[PDB]
Structure 1
Amino acid sequence: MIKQRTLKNIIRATGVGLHSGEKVYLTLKPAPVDTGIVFSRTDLDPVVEIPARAENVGETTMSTTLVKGDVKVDTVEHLLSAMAGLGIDNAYVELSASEVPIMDGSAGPFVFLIQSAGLQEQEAAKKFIRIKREVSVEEGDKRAVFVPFDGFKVSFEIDFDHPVFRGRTQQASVDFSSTSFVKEVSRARTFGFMRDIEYLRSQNLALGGSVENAIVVDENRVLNEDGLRYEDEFVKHKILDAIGDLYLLGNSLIGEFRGFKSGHALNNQLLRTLIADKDAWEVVTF
């Protein structure tokens, strides 16, 4: 059989919240079988625990935000993209504050951190959610869809107007049978156009953001001296985001996803619509 996975050792790291600006301490620990990924606010009395499941998603406005009563955990998508990408079923994630640290804006630092723990194969068969029927959601020109597939394959498309996309498809597919998450996806960074960023900073958001933890773009060009990590880094990051938002199903996926111009909100509507349509999915082991 294929068996469940957790970490071997505790791990710490440090950083700033992309939106919040606050310094935050992160700790990863091992977890028993059938626990899932669980976020814990350790700065509060009592301590607040929130499973990383579609049911706990409070806001979806330019991040994915876990909510429980009056308490937030902000911007969880990149860490979960990482936990998805190394097949981590079980793990506790303690935070000193309300936002996960941005680090370099990619899953790079999380993917290495988890490898630094080591991998514990646990005595329990791994569970997958398999797609049985087509499911899709639309909103204006936007679209997100699950199709059945004996594998795991993600595709995405964006549709921006900018010099930087001149000549380009703004299109990327990745079949994870034949490519590496860590190599071909994990490193793509969070991006932002100046105007979008200034509109956030007027509403008391994007406070930890700069060229150290994100790609910034003016009317002309990428402002980052050292340039891009891939020729298609922007659409690659939308795929990394999608992979984090899907891991809110609580298990790894047997199927195919396709996004067209979609984000945190439409990605989450697709989960709820699939979950609600019982005949389109089933839990399975090997």
Structure 2
Amino acid sequence: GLEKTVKEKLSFEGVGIHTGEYSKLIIHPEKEGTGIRFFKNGVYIPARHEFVVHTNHSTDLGFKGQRIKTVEHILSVLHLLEITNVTIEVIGNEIPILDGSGWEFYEAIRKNILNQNREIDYFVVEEPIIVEDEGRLIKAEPSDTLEVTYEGEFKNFLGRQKFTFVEGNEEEIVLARTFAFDWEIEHIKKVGLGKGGSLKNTLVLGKDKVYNPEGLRYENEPVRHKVFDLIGDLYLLGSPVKGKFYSFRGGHSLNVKLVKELAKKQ
């Protein structure tokens, strides 16, 4: 694969799911070897694990006093389309959640790619590796292509489900929205988050009900979204990844922990 960028600057705006504030993104084209980096109030924040500052309910990056919340969905979409060089100008403190998935991001960026002059320097999983955390576990091993599998165990009716993404099946996970359980909400609201969450950007699930009148987009939309989240967090490795990943009840914190590990020994 060749490094890629966008043909022209792309704009996305809307409310951030956690800040409740309105924000805007401007994806600017960059040259080969530039990498992926965010831009806010004069500072450039590399989409790398060294800059992660929060992993509860979202993955946030920060540097020199500037923080950007929820970079995972845009990062995931970017990772899936192999865009390797762009500056993401952020006007606000959080990426717009939009519809909760990566559809609007995917559609736009997809029909605006620009192949550049350089073979992508993929991050390859050389040796196996596993990170655990009281019940949770993420196993990563060598693979020619990107293969991500998430297996969740829900207290609710979804029971236990697992979904697998393989290169070429991008459209199967880009439409999977952000989801939360009614019982989580009071907590998320208490800790200062979810200020911008509604049934328009979040899929709310009860012990046996789906609050959204629209319903689920797939019988397993939640695990598909967890795969989507993990693919976004993986991009924090600095470059497109190739490897077989299996996450069991994984999340951002653990996702980020796996990356830091993969970074160390490889």
TM-score normalized by the length of structure 1: 0.90
1:61 aligns with 2:56: yes
Greater radius of gyration (CA): 1
What is the correspondence of 1:2-41 to structure 2 with a 5 Å cutoff?
2-41=1-40
Runs of 4+ off more than 2 Å: none
2:156 maps to 162
User: What secondary structure sits across from 2:153 in the alignment?
Assistant: coil
From 137, 146, 164, the counterpart of 1:143: 137
Q: Which one of 188, 199, 212 corresponds to residue 200 of structure 1?
A: 188
Distance 1:139 1:258 in 2: 14
Alignment gaps of 5+ in structure 1 = 279-286
CA distance in 1, matches of 2:240, 2:192: 36
**Residue 127 (structure 2) aligned to one of 130, 133, 136:** 133
| Residue of structure 2 aligned with 1:82, choices 77, 93, 110 | 77
Q: How many Å apart are 1:10 and its aligned residue? A: 1.0
Name the residue aligned to 2:222. 234
Q: Residue 257 of structure 1 corresponds to which residue in structure 2? A: 245
Q: 1:110 maps to what in 2?
A: 105
Cα deviation, residue 175, structure 1: 2.2
2:177 to 186, 189, 209: 189
SS at match of 1:50: strand
Distance 1:93 1:253 in 2: 20
Instruction: Compute the displacement of 1:228 (Å).
Output: 1.0
Q: For 2:107, what is the secondary structure of its paired residue?
A: helix
TM-score relative to the length of structure 2: 0.96
In the alignment, structure 2 segments of 5+ residues that lack a partner are none
Moved more, 101-110 or 249-258: 249-258
On the 8 A contact 2:37/2:45 being kept in 1, the answer is: yes
- Identical counterparts, % of pairs: 36
Q: Note the C-alpha offset of 1:127.
A: 1.0
Equivalent of residue 255 in structure 2, options 267, 270, 279: 267
Partner amino acid for 1:92?
A: T
In the aligned structure 2, how far is the partner of 1:277 from the partner of 1:29? 33
TM-aligned CA deviation for residue 112 of structure 1: 1.2
| CA-CA distance at 1:219 after TM superposition | 3.5
